Nucleic acid binder design. Structure first.
Ligand code: K
Ligand code: K
Ligand code: K
Ligand code: K
Ligand code: K
Ligand code: K
Ligand code: K
Ligand code: K
Ligand code: K
Ligand code: K
Ligand code: K
Ligand code: K
Ligand code: K
Ligand code: K
Ligand code: K
Ligand code: K
Ligand code: MG
Ligand code: MG
Ligand code: MG
Ligand code: MG
Ligand code: MG
Ligand code: MG
Ligand code: MG
Ligand code: MG
Ligand code: MG
Ligand code: MG
Ligand code: MG
Ligand code: MG
Ligand code: MG
Ligand code: MG
Ligand code: MG
Ligand code: MG
Ligand code: MG
Ligand code: MG
Ligand code: MG
Ligand code: MG
Ligand code: MG
Ligand code: MG
Ligand code: MG
Ligand code: MG
Ligand code: MG
Ligand code: MG
Ligand code: MG
Ligand code: MG
Ligand code: MG
Ligand code: MG
Ligand code: MG
Ligand code: MG
Ligand code: MG
Ligand code: MG
Ligand code: MG
Ligand code: MG
Ligand code: MG
Ligand code: MG
Lengths: 206, 158, 54, 172, 55
RNA sequence: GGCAGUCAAGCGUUCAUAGCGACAUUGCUUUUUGAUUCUUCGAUGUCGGCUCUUCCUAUCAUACCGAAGCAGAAUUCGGUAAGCGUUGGAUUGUUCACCCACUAAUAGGGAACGUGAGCUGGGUUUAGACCGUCGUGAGACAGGUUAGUUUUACCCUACUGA
RNA sequence: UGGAGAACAGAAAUCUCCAGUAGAACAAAAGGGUAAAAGCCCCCUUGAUUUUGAUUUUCAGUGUGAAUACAAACCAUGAAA
RNA sequence: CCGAAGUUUCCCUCAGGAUAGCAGAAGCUCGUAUCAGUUUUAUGAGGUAAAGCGAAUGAUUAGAGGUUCCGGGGUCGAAAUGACCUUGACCUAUUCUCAAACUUUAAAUAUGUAAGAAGUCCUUGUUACUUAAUUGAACGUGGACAUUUGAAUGAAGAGCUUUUAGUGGGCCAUUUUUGGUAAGCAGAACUGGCGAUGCGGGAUGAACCGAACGUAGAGUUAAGGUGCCGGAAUACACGCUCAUCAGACACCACAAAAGGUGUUAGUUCAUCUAGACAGCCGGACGGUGGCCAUGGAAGUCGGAAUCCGCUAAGGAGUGUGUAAC
RNA sequence: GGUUGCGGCCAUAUCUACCAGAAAGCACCGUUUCCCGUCCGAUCAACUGUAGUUAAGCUGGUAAGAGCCUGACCGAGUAGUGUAGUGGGUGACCAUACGCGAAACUCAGGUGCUGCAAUCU
């Protein structure tokens, strides 16, 4: 086996990123952070649900992948692969060391871990509001892969935007929003007037 | 092994300010130092000559000597259980007049006026400064200012 | 065998027993390190002031 | 805390030259004395407004007595408190003769049932439930039935002496 | 009017006091448990009372 | 190192959970070995076996039960249970291992890695000697080999009897 | 460094224009510093000199090393400061 | 009676010395200064915590648009600085996430200086220095200003000297902190302690809490306690908890993930006096054949759902289902 | 007010794109004997203010401009942090008490000021 995760649970050390000083570090177990219908437009999926850390701790790259796979699989079976967009919101940048007497004890790189705070979002899922119960379950299943306490929170915001659901709607009823692939661009009342009128024709027209 | 060269640990201390690199402005060179003047030491990293050791960064002392490019400053350095007098030879680019003294002299002047004014007017004046005092009594009306009741708010998530 | 390497534990307490004495100031400090050209003249100036209050 | 009083506390930011008459803010604070009441006032003002005791002043502190201290009232009480895990809102109901008696009970309750200490609790609102239909809690409702009577079975009289020369009766 | 005078009592004994509050306590002539003095309130004295609040 | 959980993607004809179980993740234990160097260097006799007692349970057998992918028979998973047993041998100093055999069963461990004024002394680990490698040599080897003194109780307690 | 141009000539030769806050260089580690320069090229030179003191770092406020600012000379360079 | 050190620098130095420090003694010069392990006002310095990355460097997830006088897959295309469909590259606007040896910004705590008679102002002497100079510079003469003389609090006297002892293994706690899976482990920072120290408390215990000690008397308390051991309420009050391993006071003498229709409170949705939820009770068919399939379909070895009956009542419909209205 | 020479502070002064500019100044611009310097009178040197020109430089103005600057009880008394408890929590960590207190963000405003000398409808 690998060393048990209890050995690397808490944030005891300063961040030890991969760097010019710390060259020969192994690859992360988690490579994919975006799953489901990642191409989906902002208007497609209003409901956002979050898995949120309630603990100052470290999560291994192996737990993030295992939790990803669990949550994805469940959501695709019960609702289908295009019913949600799942984003993993933590990247394991902190390298864990392992020694392997106490003369010359500075360790070698062992694996990677993500340092999470209290209140920090670990996973996010956007869906249609029909699909709340499914997403909440898939995130519930993921929780068993991580150490510590996580909470499952229904967001007041529209999808992955930073706008409360009514706010976003008013800005879309006006011409103040335009699609930019998966995300969105907002009209500012600032900058050149000419270039704004190129980018946001439906505003002004009113 | 360990390393304790003359500029060890100065990486940030002798950096120029952001967007303030390059030539020293001329006012630095037109300031006039006189023996007894109180100066603050702050190394300009662009002028490698005449440079104070990092210990003196942020220390204030008295000019004791004036030469072509430079001033001698006296600083009191704590060594062990006592202060030794140190004498530094600094180029003027690393020095500036302490405004502490500039604003004390304005008070000596102002006190002199007040004291003269007091004798001729023929009364008696307080020249010591006082610490900030307890507030005196005061009536606060509610005319167009009726008190507005606040309550603690419930917990919300965001 | 191995021992302790360094500490400043207890050193400020030792320093404050006989206090940290400020260095003591005089009217008339040493003209020591003062520019020699200035000093050489200043002798000549002080000479004349004596031969004048006489 | 202790046996509670209720205080009006009124404060304001100190006058500037620019703003010579700042807006007055008022709170009702349950606390066992004035010194604590003033401390709570700042504790709450600083959560709401940009102000702090250093930059502010208390203009008034007045004890508010109960209007009808021997009328039995049903109080609703809204509370925020911190658990070990999180933070929760709660509505509870309390039947008493005063707001001050209701709050004493509230604090004792939250300690008993949720292990929430005084530091962990905010009383959001306390209000007399005017009509009996609006009481929402079975543990209060049962004291509002018509011609309520009940016995107290199994009475235990405390003895002064160590020995008793007859077996006691628990009758009433 | 804000109060002009405080009375101060020392409430803690003389062991395990840090240096800064220990000096302040000596400056207010409070060198023994239950000794007390009057202090004229000003910003200069209020900031002393902050330092020695636990004692 | 050892033992046990949680989740459940899969396996299991079909069927996640009879029996299992990936990716993860929470623990317990001190019968492994490390890490450390606190105690002992005016000395706590240093491997193993033999003898003998007692204790733990994480139960191999035996009692009474629940479950099954339990027809029967055989078996497997689990509970209360340590009351009662748990062996004879070939090779090795062995601990460990391995095989033959019997058996209801040949479970695992602790007690100063129980137990040397209880034995023994095969191993190791003084001084003799041989070999191999190493070393110019004296000599070295947690490499092999052979030979090598095992002391005292009559005191106190404990225990057994008087 | 990039762009756009010029026989052989191409991803890379040399020439030209435009952009270019330094993304270059500055012997040698790393950090700091530097743009009509501290970089690049050119001209002239020997202050890499003489006489001894004071001062800063390390510090015992000893030595050694290294460095700073003057003095008295004699020089270099520059139209000069 | 006073009262330490385990620290600094050097040493064939690391179980030792010298050196500085801490300590005692002797005093000496004076007599309320100069002061100060402190605040205040004024004025500096700093690149840690936090923050930032649609800001530089470096790391990093995702699409979107754009462009190759060129990278490549698909296929027309004489060939094309061609024609397009598609994958890397590159550019533009965005997006998720980071840094002990990154940073525009930037605390808190800690830290330098000042807060006057050795001052301030006026006047005009000396010089070989300096000036174009009768200019300056430095030091003076004479004159003027004195207690509200220039913030606060304190001051047990202040200042100065000689000489010499012991020590130069440390260790612990809170907070900051490095190595290490961790350690009653190793190593630093600031303070307080133990060592050198009894006393009350924590049963017990170097270091925790309280509090530091001449000999006695009285009173009151700290920390901790008040069923009994044991001095002190089997006090008062509101609740919670029943354990066929209950629980019971910091340091501290451990328990987790995960679970429970045990019990208590609570949050948010839902139903409900037009009658719910249970339970007993009847019926649960008719019908534009609406509509597929003709081994059957007025639902089944596979279903894409859709009309119509008297009515307080429904539906092309499952628990076995002849293959069947 | 404009302009020049020399400046102070060194973006409110920079950058991008456009437009305007009387007078004077400044500028571009003409010339190669002389001093002088170049591969090259392009730069640098000299000579003439004569032949020409506001085209550029320069100055100002415009821009829901980029950047920069100022302020805000904007965010936020948030993050962080000094001090305290025989506070909570198995822990990780957290709350409270007496203090100090950001950065991003958002919004509003702004976009060179000025000294010495000379000169000009
Ligand atoms: K978890
Ligand atoms: K040693
Ligand atoms: K050592
Ligand atoms: K040992
Ligand atoms: K020994
Ligand atoms: K047998
Ligand atoms: K023999
Ligand atoms: K030296
Ligand atoms: K920032
Ligand atoms: K960045
Ligand atoms: K000594
Ligand atoms: K010594
Ligand atoms: K003690
Ligand atoms: K004790
Ligand atoms: K006390
Ligand atoms: K007892
Ligand atoms: Mg293990
Ligand atoms: Mg570490
Ligand atoms: Mg180093
Ligand atoms: Mg040099
Ligand atoms: Mg030592
Ligand atoms: Mg060393
Ligand atoms: Mg002995
Ligand atoms: Mg013996
Ligand atoms: Mg023995
Ligand atoms: Mg058992
Ligand atoms: Mg053992
Ligand atoms: Mg043994
Ligand atoms: Mg023996
Ligand atoms: Mg033995
Ligand atoms: Mg024995
Ligand atoms: Mg033998
Ligand atoms: Mg032998
Ligand atoms: Mg006998
Ligand atoms: Mg020296
Ligand atoms: Mg050296
Ligand atoms: Mg003493
Ligand atoms: Mg030597
Ligand atoms: Mg010894
Ligand atoms: Mg930093
Ligand atoms: Mg630093
Ligand atoms: Mg940080
Ligand atoms: Mg510091
Ligand atoms: Mg000695
Ligand atoms: Mg030593
Ligand atoms: Mg020793
Ligand atoms: Mg040790
Ligand atoms: Mg000792
Ligand atoms: Mg105990
Ligand atoms: Mg008693
Ligand atoms: Mg739980
Ligand atoms: Mg020309
Ligand atoms: Mg024009
Ligand atoms: Mg304490």
């Amino acid at each position: 086996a690998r060393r048990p995760a209890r050995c690397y649970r808490y944030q005891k050390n300063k961040p030890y990123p991969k760097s010019r000083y710390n060259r020969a570090v192994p690859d992360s177990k988690i490579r994919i952070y975006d799953l489901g219908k990642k191409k989906a437009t902002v208007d497609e999926f209003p409901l956002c649900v979050h898995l949120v850390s309630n603990e100052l701790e470290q999560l291994s790259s192996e737990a993030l992948e295992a939790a990803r796979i669990c949550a994805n699989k469940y959501m695709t079976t019960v609702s289908g692969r295009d019913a949600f967009h799942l984003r993993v919101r933590v990247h394991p940048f902190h390298v864990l060391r392992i020694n392997k007497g106490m003369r010359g004890a500075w360790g070698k790189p062992h694996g990677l871990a993500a340092r999470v705070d209290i209140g920090q979002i670990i996973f996010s899922v956007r869906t249609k509001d029909s699909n709340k119960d499914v997403v909440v379950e898939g995130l519930r299943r993921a929780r068993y892969k991580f150490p510590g306490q996580q909470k499952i929170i229904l967001s007041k915001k529209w999808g992955f935007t930073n706008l409360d659901r009514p706010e976003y709607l008013k800005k879309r009823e006006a011409g103040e929003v335009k699609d930019d692939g998966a995300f969105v661009k907002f009209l500012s009342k600032k900058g050149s007037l000419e270039n704004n009128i190129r980018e946001f024709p439906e505003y002004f027209a009113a | 092994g360990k390393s304790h060269g003359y500029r060890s640990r100065t990486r940030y201390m002798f950096q120029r300010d952001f967007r303030k690199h390059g030539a020293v402005h001329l006012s630095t060179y037109l300031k006039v130092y006189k023996v007894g003047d109180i100066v603050d030491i702050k190394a300009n990293g662009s002028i490698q000559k005449g440079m104070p050791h990092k210990f003196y960064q942020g220390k204030t002392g008295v000019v004791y000597n004036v030469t072509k490019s430079s001033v001698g400053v006296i600083i009191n350095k704590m060594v062990g259980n006592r202060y030794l007098e140190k004498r530094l030879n600094l180029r003027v680019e690393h020095i500036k007049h302490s405004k502490c003294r500039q604003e004390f002299l304005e008070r000596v002047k102002a006190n002199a006026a007040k004291r003269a004014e007091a004798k001729a007017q023929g009364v008696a004046v307080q020249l010591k400064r006082q610490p900030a005092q307890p507030r005196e009594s005061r009536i606060v009306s509610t005319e167009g200012n009726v008190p507005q009741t606040l309550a603690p708010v419930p917990y919300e998530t965001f | 065998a191995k021992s302790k390497n360094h500490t400043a534990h207890n050193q400020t307490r030792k320093a404050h027993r006989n206090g940290i004495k400020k260095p003591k100031t005089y009217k008339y400090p040493s003209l020591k390190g003062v520019d020699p050209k200035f000093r050489r003249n200043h002798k000549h100036a002080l000479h004349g002031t004596a031969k004048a209050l006489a | 805390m202790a046996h509670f009083k209720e205080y009006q506390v009124i404060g304001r930011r100190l006058p500037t030259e620019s703003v010579p008459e700042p807006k007055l803010f008022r709170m009702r604070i349950f606390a066992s004395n004035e010194v604590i009441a003033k401390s709570r006032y700042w504790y709450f003002l600083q959560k709401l407004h940009k102000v702090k005791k250093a930059s502010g002043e208390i203009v008034s502190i007045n004890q508010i007595n109960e209007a009808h201290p021997t009328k039995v009232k049903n109080f609703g009480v809204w509370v925020r408190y911190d658990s070990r895990s999180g933070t929760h809102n709660m509505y509870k109901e309390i039947r008493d003769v005063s707001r001050v008696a209701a709050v004493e009970t509230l604090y004792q309750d939250m300690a008993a049932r949720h292990r929430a200490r005084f530091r962990s609790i905010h009383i959001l609102k306390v209000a007399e439930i005017e009509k009996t239909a609006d009481v929402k809690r079975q543990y209060v409702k049962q004291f509002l039935t018509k011609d309520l009577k009940f016995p107290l079975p199994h009475r235990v009289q405390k003895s002064t002496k160590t020995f008793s020369y007859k077996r006691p009766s628990t009758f009433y | 009017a804000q109060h002009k005078l405080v009375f101060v009592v020392r409430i803690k004994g003389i062991n395990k006091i840090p240096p800064k509050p220990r000096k302040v306590l000596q400056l207010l002539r409070l060198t023994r448990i239950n000794s007390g003095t009057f202090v004229k309130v000003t910003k200069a004295t209020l900031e002393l009372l902050k330092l020695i609040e636990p004692y």
